[PDB]
């Protein structure tokens, strides 16, 4: 049971750039979009050193981890289930002070659409603070096995999906371009090369039995996670003679203010 | 003949952060390690805006670019022979008021040795301006060949080495710690995600050549090469399908002063 890269990723962002927000002196509106576990959201609102009395909403499009979080989620702080690729419920445009997305480890569909609706669930003069995955063996593998001549065919109806800055030069440049001309007035974009290491396979099929993106069934599940282990041992992401798998990764971390 | 991500990312550092660097009034001596081709410290002697009226230096240890090199360099700009891996020649220790050291595409053996060598070249209040690879699939390519059971132990008495920054987390926090326990006062240090693409495996297999660390032999260097490019393949480095190769790498940017 390892969400830990997402987390450890999600708390040392935070602390580092905690230090450069800037908090309004009362009545405070915060939001993280994708929370799944408040392990994350938990530790956001003991961590934020200012007054939302009763306001920390956040969100996630799987209903179950929801009302898990939910659950454990106390009053004073909402959960609801929002996809932030669906169309806004303008209800909340404007509301929110400080916004969070630390990445979620599933490919997004559409990221200007995201980005506008940040942009536009953000207050007058909010601070919204992102990190997402400029590359991810992960999404390289499950790529490749999409390609493989035994799968080739059978997962040829699904979308592989594109990224304008997924594993594009300069990414960085390419985000900050893309945030301004949605408007925001303030935009400081970094990228973090990472490294997470699984020290037995065990761990890491479950990873990709939790991320990966293609349904099959209950059948096949077992076979088709078989050869995305088979293709990782290929492209060495996993080293076949230590059984472990270390992931190289790029994070961009981005600061901006509307 | 693709030196091209080599002078690309050279010229693109050097441009985006010449407005960033402070020159003295005059008597300025500036030093470039590992020149290869001038056509990179050319662009670099016309792209600085001060007076070095007759003192360019610069250095690699292939003596045989380095006369070519030496023969296109015309006077006002010395060219010698130099490993910064070597033993410093006190004779230029403090000599340069810039030094340039833009990555050279060939693994370094001992990097500290190299950090303090560019601290004891730079004068008082020096300037460095040096990048260097953090990740580069190309040796993650060079050293997966070294273990196939085919080459494995005919390649088991060369140095794989080790980086103390290279495939590491936050290698840009790793390096800045580094290069001020060497003694620099400023140091600015960032992580850059950067794309080349080879539209043909011939230009790929061209590169593969020219960086190929291991000697072999005019007898198995065709053979060798051939099954770096068969590994390629299952690295998904090459595109089987569109006869295309695609570097993802990263790329550490150092601004320090003494």
Redesign the interface.
């Known amino acids: 049971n390892s969400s830990s890269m997402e987390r450890r990723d999600a708390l040392n962002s935070l602390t580092e750039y905690l230090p450069k927000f800037k908090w309004k002196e009362s009545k405070e509106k915060i939001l993280d979009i994708g929370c799944a576990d408040g392990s994350v959201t938990n530790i956001i609102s003991s961590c934020c050193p200012t007054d939302f009395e009763l306001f920390e909403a956040c969100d996630v499009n799987v209903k179950s981890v929801k009302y898990a979080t939910e659950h454990y989620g106390t009053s004073k702080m909402r959960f609801r289930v929002m996809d932030i690729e669906s169309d806004l419920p303008k209800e909340m445009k404007g509301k929110f002070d400080h916004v969070f997305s630390f990445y979620t480890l599933h490919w997004i569909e559409n990221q200007e659409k995201a980005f506008q609706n940040i942009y536009d669930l953000t207050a007058d003069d909010g601070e919204c603070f992102l990190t997402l995955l ?2 991810m063996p992960v999404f ?1 593998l499950f790529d ?1 096995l999409k ?1 493989t001549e035994k799968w080739r065919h059978w997962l040829r109806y699904i979308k592989n999906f594109i990224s304008p800055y997924y ?6 440049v390419v985000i900050e371009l893309l945030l301004k001309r949605v408007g925001f007035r303030y935009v400081d974009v ?6 997470f290491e699984f020290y037995d396979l065990k761990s890491f099929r479950n990873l990709l039995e939790a991320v990966s993106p293609f349904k099959v069934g209950q059948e096949l599940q077992e076979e088709l996670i078989d050869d995305v282990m088979e293709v990782a041992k ?3 992401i996993i080293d076949t ?1 230590n059984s472990t798998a ?1 992931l ?1 990764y ?1 994070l961009v971390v981005i600061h901006c203010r509307k």
């Open positions: 400029a590359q390289n490749a390609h594993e594009t030069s300069d990414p960085d970094r990228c973090r090369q990472k490294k290929e492209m060495r003679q270390k190289i790029n």
